[PDB]
PDB file of C-alpha atoms and ligand atoms in Angstrom:
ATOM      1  CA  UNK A   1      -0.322 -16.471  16.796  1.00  0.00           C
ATOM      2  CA  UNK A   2       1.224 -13.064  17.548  1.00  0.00           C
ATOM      3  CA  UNK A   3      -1.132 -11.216  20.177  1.00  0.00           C
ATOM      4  CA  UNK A   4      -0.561  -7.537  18.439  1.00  0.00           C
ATOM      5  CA  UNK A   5      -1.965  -6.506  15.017  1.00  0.00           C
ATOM      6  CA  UNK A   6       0.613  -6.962  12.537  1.00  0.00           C
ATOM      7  CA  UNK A   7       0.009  -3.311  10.444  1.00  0.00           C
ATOM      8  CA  UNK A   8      -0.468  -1.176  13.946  1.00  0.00           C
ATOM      9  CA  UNK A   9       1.466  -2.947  16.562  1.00  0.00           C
ATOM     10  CA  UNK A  10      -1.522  -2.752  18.366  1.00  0.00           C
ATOM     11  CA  UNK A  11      -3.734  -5.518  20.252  1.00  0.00           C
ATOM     12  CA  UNK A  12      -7.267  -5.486  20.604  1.00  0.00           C
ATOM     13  CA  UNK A  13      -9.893  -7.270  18.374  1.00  0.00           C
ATOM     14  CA  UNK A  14      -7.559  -9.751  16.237  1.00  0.00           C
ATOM     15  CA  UNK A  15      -8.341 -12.252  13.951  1.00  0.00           C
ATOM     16  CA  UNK A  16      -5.469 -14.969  13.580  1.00  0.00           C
ATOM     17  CA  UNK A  17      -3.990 -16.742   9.708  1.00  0.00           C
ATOM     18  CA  UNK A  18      -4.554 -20.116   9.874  1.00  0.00           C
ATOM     19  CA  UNK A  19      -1.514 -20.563   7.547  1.00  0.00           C
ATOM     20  CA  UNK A  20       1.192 -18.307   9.983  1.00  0.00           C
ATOM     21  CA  UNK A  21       1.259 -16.574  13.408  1.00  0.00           C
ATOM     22  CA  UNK A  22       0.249 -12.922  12.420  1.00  0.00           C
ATOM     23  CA  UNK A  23      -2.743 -11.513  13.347  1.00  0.00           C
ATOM     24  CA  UNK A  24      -4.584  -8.145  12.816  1.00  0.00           C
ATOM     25  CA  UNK A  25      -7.638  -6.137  13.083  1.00  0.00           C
ATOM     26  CA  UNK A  26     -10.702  -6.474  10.779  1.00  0.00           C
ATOM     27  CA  UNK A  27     -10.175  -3.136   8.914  1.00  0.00           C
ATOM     28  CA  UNK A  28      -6.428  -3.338   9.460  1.00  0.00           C
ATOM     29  CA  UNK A  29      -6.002  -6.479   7.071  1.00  0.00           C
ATOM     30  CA  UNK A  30      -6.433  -5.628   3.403  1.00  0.00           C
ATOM     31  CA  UNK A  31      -8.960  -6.616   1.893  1.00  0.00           C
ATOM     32  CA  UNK A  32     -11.029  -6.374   5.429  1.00  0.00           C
ATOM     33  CA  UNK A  33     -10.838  -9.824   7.023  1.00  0.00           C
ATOM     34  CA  UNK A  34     -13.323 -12.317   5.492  1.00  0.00           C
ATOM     35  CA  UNK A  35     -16.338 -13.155   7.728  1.00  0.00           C
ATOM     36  CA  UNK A  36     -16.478 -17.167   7.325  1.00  0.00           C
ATOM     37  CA  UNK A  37     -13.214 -18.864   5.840  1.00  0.00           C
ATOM     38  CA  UNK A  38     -11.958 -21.774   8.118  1.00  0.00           C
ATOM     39  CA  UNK A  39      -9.175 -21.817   7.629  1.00  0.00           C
ATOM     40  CA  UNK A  40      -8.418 -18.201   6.557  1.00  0.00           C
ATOM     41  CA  UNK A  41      -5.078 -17.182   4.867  1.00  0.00           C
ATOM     42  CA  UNK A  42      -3.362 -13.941   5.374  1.00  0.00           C
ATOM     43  CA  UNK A  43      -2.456 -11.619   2.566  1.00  0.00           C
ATOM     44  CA  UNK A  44       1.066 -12.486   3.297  1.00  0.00           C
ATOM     45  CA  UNK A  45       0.593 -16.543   3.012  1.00  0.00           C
ATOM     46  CA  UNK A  46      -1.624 -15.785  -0.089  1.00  0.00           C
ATOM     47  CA  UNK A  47       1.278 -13.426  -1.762  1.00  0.00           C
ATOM     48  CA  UNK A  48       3.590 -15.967  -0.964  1.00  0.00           C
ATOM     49  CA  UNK A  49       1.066 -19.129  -2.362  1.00  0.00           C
ATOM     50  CA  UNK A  50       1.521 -17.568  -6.183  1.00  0.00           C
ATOM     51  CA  UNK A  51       5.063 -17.073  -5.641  1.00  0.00           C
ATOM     52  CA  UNK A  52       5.199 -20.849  -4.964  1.00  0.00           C
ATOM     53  CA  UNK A  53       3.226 -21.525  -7.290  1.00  0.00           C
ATOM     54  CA  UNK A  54       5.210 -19.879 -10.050  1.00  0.00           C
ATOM     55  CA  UNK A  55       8.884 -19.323  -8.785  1.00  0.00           C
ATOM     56  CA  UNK A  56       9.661 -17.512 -12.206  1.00  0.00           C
ATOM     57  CA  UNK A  57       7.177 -14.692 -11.359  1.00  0.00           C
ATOM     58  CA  UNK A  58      10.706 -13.235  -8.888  1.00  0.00           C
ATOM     59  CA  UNK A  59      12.631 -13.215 -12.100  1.00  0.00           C
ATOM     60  CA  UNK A  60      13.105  -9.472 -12.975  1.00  0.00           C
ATOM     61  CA  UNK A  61      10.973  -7.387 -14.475  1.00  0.00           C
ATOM     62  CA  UNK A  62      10.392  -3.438 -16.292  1.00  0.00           C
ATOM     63  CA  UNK A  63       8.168  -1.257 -14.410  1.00  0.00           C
ATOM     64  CA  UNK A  64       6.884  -0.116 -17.667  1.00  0.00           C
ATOM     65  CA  UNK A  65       5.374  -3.936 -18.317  1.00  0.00           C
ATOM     66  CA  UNK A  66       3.970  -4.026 -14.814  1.00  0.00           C
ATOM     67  CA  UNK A  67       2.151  -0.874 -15.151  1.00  0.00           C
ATOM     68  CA  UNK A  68       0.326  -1.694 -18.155  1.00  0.00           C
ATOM     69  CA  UNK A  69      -0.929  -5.132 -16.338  1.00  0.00           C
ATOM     70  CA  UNK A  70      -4.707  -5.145 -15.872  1.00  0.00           C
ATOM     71  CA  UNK A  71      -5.959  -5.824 -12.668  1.00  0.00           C
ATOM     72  CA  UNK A  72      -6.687  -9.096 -12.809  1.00  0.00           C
ATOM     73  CA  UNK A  73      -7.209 -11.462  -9.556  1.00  0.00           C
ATOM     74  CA  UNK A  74      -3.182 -11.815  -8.735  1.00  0.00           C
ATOM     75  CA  UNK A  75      -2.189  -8.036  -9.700  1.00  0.00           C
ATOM     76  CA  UNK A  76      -5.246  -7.032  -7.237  1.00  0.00           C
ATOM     77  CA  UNK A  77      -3.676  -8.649  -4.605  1.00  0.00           C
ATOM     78  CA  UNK A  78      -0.415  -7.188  -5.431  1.00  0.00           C
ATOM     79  CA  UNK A  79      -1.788  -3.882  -4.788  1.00  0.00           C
ATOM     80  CA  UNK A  80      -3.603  -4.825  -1.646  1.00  0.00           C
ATOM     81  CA  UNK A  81      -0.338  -5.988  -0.445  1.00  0.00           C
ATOM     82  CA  UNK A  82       1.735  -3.190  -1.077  1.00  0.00           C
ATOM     83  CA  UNK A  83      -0.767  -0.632   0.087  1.00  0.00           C
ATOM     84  CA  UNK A  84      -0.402  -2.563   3.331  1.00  0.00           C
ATOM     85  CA  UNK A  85       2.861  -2.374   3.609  1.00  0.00           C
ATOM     86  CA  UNK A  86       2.508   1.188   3.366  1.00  0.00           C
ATOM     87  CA  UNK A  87       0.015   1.433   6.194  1.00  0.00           C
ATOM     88  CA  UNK A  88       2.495  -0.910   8.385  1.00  0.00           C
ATOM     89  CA  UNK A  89       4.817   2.159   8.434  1.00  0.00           C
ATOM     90  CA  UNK A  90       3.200   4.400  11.267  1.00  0.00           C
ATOM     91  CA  UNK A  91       4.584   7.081   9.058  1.00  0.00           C
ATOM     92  CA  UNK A  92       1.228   6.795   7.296  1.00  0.00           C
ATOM     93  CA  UNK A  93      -0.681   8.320   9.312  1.00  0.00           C
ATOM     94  CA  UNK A  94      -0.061  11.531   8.023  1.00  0.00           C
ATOM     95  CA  UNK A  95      -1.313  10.481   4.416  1.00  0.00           C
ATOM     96  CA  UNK A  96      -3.908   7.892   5.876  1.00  0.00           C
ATOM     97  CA  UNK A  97      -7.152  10.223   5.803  1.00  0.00           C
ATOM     98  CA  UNK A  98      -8.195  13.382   3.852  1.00  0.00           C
ATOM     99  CA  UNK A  99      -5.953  15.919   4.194  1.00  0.00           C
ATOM    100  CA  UNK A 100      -6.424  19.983   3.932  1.00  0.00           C
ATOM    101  CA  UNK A 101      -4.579  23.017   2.902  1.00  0.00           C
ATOM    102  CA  UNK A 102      -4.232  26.297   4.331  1.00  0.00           C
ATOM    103  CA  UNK A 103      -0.714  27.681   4.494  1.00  0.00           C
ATOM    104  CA  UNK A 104       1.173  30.989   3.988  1.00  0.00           C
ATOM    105  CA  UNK A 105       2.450  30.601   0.900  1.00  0.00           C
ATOM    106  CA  UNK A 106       1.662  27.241  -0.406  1.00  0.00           C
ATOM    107  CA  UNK A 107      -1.406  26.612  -2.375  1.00  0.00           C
ATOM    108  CA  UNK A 108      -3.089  23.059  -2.138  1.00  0.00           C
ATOM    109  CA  UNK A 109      -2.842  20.368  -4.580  1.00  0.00           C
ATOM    110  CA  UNK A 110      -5.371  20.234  -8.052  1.00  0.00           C
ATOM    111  CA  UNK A 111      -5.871  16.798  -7.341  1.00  0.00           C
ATOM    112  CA  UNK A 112      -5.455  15.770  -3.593  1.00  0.00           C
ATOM    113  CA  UNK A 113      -5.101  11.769  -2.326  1.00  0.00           C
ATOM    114  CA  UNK A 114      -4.668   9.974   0.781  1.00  0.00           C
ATOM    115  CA  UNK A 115      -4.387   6.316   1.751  1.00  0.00           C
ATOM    116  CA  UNK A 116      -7.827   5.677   2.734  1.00  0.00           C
ATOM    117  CA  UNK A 117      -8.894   7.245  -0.653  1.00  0.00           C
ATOM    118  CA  UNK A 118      -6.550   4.350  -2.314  1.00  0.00           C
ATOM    119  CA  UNK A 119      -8.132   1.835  -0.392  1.00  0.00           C
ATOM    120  CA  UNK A 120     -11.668   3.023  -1.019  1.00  0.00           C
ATOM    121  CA  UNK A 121     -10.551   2.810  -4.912  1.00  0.00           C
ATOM    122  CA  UNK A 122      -9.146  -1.134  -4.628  1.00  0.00           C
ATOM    123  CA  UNK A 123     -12.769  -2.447  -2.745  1.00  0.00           C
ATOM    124  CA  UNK A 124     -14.376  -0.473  -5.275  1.00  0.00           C
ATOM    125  CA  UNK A 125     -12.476  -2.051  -8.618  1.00  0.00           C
ATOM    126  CA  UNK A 126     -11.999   1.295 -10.308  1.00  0.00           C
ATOM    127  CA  UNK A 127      -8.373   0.315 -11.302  1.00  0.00           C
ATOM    128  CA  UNK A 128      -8.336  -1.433 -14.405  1.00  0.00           C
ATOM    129  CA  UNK A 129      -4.344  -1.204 -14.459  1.00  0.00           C
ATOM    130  CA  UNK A 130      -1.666  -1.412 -12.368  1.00  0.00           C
ATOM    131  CA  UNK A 131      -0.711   1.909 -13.697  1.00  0.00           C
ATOM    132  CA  UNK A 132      -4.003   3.580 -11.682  1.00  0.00           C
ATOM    133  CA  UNK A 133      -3.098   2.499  -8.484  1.00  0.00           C
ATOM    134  CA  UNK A 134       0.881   2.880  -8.316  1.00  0.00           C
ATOM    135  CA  UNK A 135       0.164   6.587  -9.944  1.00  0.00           C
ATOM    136  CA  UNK A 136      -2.408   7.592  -7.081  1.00  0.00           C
ATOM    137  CA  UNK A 137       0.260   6.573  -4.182  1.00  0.00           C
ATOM    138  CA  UNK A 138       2.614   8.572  -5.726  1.00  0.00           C
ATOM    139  CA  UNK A 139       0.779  11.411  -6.248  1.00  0.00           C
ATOM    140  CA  UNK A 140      -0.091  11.413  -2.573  1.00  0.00           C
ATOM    141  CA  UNK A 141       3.621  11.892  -2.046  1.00  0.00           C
ATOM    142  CA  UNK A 142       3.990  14.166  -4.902  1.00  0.00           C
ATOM    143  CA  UNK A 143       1.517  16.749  -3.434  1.00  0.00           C
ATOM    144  CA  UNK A 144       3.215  16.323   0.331  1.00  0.00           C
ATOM    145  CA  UNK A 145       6.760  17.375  -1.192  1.00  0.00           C
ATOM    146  CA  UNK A 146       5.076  20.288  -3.576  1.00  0.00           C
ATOM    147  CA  UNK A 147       2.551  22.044  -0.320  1.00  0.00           C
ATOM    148  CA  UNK A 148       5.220  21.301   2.468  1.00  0.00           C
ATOM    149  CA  UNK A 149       8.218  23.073   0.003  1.00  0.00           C
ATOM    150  CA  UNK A 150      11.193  24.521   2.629  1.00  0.00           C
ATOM    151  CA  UNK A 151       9.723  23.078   5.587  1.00  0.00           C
ATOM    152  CA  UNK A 152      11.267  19.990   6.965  1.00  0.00           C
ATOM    153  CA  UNK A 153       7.915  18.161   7.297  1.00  0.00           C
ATOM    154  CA  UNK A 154       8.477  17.704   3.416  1.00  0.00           C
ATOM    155  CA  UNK A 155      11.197  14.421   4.982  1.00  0.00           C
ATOM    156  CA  UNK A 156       7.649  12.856   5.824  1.00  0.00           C
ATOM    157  CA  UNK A 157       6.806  12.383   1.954  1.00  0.00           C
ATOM    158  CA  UNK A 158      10.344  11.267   1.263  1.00  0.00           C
ATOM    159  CA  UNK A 159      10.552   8.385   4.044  1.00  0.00           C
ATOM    160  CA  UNK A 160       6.833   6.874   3.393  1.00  0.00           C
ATOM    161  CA  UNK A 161       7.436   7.234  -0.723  1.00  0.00           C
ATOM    162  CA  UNK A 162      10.788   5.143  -0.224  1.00  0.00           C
ATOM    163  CA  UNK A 163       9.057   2.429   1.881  1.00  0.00           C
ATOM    164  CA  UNK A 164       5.958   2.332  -1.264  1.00  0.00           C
ATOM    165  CA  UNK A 165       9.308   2.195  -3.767  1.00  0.00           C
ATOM    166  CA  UNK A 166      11.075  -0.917  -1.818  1.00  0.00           C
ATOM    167  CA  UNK A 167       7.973  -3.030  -1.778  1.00  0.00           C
ATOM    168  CA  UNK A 168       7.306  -1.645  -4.978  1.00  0.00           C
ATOM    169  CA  UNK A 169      10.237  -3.120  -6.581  1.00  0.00           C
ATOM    170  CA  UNK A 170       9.564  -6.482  -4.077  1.00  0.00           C
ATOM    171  CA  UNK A 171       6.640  -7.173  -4.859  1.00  0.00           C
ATOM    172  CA  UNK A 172       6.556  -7.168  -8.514  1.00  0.00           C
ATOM    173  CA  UNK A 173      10.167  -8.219  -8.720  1.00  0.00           C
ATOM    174  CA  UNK A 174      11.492  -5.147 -10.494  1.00  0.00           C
ATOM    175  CA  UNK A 175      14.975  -6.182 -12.053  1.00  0.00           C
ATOM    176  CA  UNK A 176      17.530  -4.869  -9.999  1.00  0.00           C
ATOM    177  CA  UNK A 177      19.801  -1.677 -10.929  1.00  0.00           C
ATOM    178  CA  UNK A 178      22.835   0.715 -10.619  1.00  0.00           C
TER     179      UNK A 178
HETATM  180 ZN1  LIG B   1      -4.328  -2.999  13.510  1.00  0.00          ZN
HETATM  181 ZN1  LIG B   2      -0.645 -15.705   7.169  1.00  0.00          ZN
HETATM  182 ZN1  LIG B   3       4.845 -22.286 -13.062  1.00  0.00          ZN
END
């Protein structure tokens, strides 16, 4: 197994898959890393277990059909997945906990989100849709771009948005455009 976290690059505490070499921390693995289970599976060996087990789930797909998917046990997962991919970016930690707003000439979002917020929301099963999930990570980077406006700090919404996109359109096998 590797001997650093694989979401923080960090070692400490780890707890090792069974099924491949990663490791992470408890609260770094999503969902938080199950207390029996031997052997335990990773998120990435159990993502890749239903691709196996149907290889026409990576033909392409419309976003608008995977949106309206209810969160049933394998679209769950999807999400947990994806949100920690986002969190693997250190770039997160800017949208990781609750943010605040006080600056000249910006006012702060109506509806403000952050990462841990999301993650809260997924133990919790208050998605019933794909839909809920993939529209509260964008709004986090939604409000970034609209408070940050002229600065350059705005480039921080952009670059963590386009890493949620890509494993966006990876994990639920968007068909590929132009
Ligand atoms: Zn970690
Ligand atoms: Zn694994
Ligand atoms: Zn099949």
């Amino acid at each position: 197994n590797s001997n650093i976290c694989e979401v923080c690059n960090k070692w400490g505490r780890l707890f090792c898959c069974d099924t491949c070499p990663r490791s992470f921390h408890e609260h770094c693995h999503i969902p938080s890393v199950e207390a029996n289970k031997n052997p335990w599976s990773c998120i990435f060996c159990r993502i890749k277990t239903i691709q196996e087990r149907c290889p026409e789930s990576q033909s392409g797909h419309q976003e608008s059909e995977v949106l309206m998917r209810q969160m049933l046990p394998e679209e769950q997962l999807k999400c947990e997945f994806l949100l920690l991919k986002v969190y693997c970016d250190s770039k997160s930690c800017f949208f990781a906990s609750e943010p605040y707003y006080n600056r000249e000439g910006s006012q702060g979002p109506q509806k403000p989100m952050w990462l841990n917020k999301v993650k809260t929301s997924l133990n919790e099963q208050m998605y019933t849709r794909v839909e809920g999930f993939v529209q509260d990570m964008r709004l986090i980077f939604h409000n970034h771009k609209e408070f940050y406006r002229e600065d350059k700090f705005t480039r921080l919404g952009i670059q963590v948005q386009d890493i949620f996109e890509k494993n966006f359109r990876n994990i639920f096998a968007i068909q590929e455009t132009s």
